[PDB]
Structure 1
Amino acid sequence: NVTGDYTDCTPLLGDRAALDSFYEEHGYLFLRNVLDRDLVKTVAEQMREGLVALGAADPHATLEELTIDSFESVDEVAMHDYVKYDAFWNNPSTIKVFEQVFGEPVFVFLSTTIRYYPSQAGSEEPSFHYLTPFHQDGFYIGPNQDFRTFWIPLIRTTRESGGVALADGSHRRGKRDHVLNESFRRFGHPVRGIPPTEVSEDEHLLHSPMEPGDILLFHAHMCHKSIPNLSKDPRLMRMSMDTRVQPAKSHRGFNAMTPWTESA
């Protein structure tokens, strides 16, 4: 169902008019090699440390060789102890990028979601229920809708290893219908997702390979979903994290102020 690549918006960063115009029309920005790659490597290594320490991964493996039997069998709460995301998001170099995007001082959510998904290529009964269906972060984050989601790869993604796919320009008609879907679950219970019918033909589904150092960010009403990891050439974990950022002056709601483990 993916029809296109993200547009490389990096050349827009030093042109406020063009940057704002693209974001207004499209509801996303794809920025390449703007984050400190050594900082990103450190986060990736921290995630690996967790997966190794918790018995899921091989201590002899490089990041790209890394694999785990199952996302679900890893203690996610313990993983949050390993991955030092707040120190990353709030590093002056990272903040500089966020500030250039918003054009004003920012506040980074105290909640981050960390994702460490093995390839399930070849699996006859794959476990993809922990992924996300089509949704808008604004459906469950608020009350303010001026936050943006910041999504980063910790190791590179491919079209086959997955990531997040975005319905281009789908952020301009408010929140769309999220209905119960038995194939997506959290805590063993079904979750709500936007049926593909509620996404227009013109709202092209974009997903592109990304490299550590890149950022994908998007509007509260941007309709987006997970792309499953079916990598085999080469087989890669999909290792990423996502938080939300907003203007420093905006109201700070429940998710803004509450760490992932607390709300989980």
Structure 2
Amino acid sequence: TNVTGDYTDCTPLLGDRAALDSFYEEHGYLFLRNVLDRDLVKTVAEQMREGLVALGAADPHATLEELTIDSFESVDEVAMHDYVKYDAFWNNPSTIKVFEQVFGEPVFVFLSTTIRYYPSQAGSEEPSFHYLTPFHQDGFYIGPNQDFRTFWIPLIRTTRESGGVALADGSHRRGKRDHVLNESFRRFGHPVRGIPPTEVSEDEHLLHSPMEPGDILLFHAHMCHKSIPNLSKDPRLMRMSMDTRVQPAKSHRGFNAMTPWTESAKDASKGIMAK
């Protein structure tokens, strides 16, 4: 793996505004352990599971960690957005309290959330990983304001093998980087764009650590990050997660902030190619 390090546990920095902001400024992310209500997170995992039983031919008697699906692509993603009640989760007072502590002011949560339910493909000779993400910055496609932050949460635990999101430590300090067409990552049967290896720095150490439901990983608009594929074997786990963006309540609310995933993903996926 190109991963060379773990996320730093930033939870004890929450009590110190100056130290929290200092870490975030240098590194471009915060990793917070067990700050969300784990029981609330479980209910969202359960919602996703029931969607997968209805739409992905998942075992109706499997536990969350026993669950699998034959194919991410066979699942109607639009219909999954009716099952997973993410807005109710993000806007729960317990969740909002955490967001407000991070920003130090009232927040607005994007009306778009991406939901991810990725089965293990350990052993597959022709794995389907084209639905993952290349190295990119969320600020490449979200704007015009660049003061939102991405909030990424596991719905069930991740392992180093089941994957998640890898962060290039401190890669958010030189603005937007070039994103170029990459045939190996696709949405709606067309390539998307990612940051090429020539815009990657060896100094921006790649980080990924296992996370538990209740944890949050959040990062700057210019943080360069990529998906880690699910090659889990023991245990063989689904990688179940969701990501939204959050910004100060006073900041401009752009297209991405105001438009649900079902009404924007297709158009945005085409739109980025003209950027």
TM-score tier by shorter-chain length is over 0.9
What is the rounded CA distance, in whole Å, between the counterparts of 2:196 and 2:228 in structure 1?
A: 15
Look up the match of 1:204. Answer: 205
The 8 Å contact of residues 185 and 192 in structure 2, kept in 1 or not, is answered as yes
1:109-158 Cα shifts (integer Å, max 9, x gaps): 00000000000000000000000000000000000000000000000000
SS of corresponding position for 1:23? helix
SS of corresponding position for 2:112? strand
2:48 corresponds to 1:47: yes
1:18-167 matched pairs, under 5 angstroms = 18-167=19-168
Structure 2 stretches lacking a partner, 5+ long: 264-273
Give the CA deviation at 1:65: 0.2
What is the rounded CA distance, in whole Å, between the counterparts of 1:196 and 1:251 in structure 2?
A: 33
Give the CA deviation at 1:196: 2.3
Give the CA deviation at 1:256: 0.1
What is the rounded CA distance, in whole Å, between the counterparts of 2:67 and 2:95 in structure 1?
A: 26
Give the CA deviation at 1:53: 1.3
1:159-183 Cα shifts (integer Å, max 9, x gaps): 0000000000000000001011110
Give the CA deviation at 1:55: 4.3
SS of corresponding position for 2:235? coil
The 8 Å contact of residues 44 and 155 in structure 2, kept in 1 or not, is answered as yes
TM-score, length of structure 2 as denominator length: 0.95
1:197-238 Cα shifts (integer Å, max 9, x gaps): 211111000000000000000000000000000000100000
TM-score, length of structure 1 as denominator length: 0.99
Between the aligned residues of both structures, percent identity stands at 99
1:10-61 Cα shifts (integer Å, max 9, x gaps): 0000100000000000000000000000100000000001000124200110
The 8 Å contact of residues 132 and 185 in structure 2, kept in 1 or not, is answered as yes
CA spacing shift, 1:167–1:55, aligned 2, 3 Å: closer
Give the CA deviation at 1:251: 0.1
Q: How many residues align?
A: 264
What is the rounded CA distance, in whole Å, between the counterparts of 2:61 and 2:10 in structure 1?
A: 37
The 8 Å contact of residues 56 and 74 in structure 2, kept in 1 or not, is answered as no
The 8 Å contact of residues 51 and 83 in structure 2, kept in 1 or not, is answered as yes
SS of corresponding position for 1:131? coil
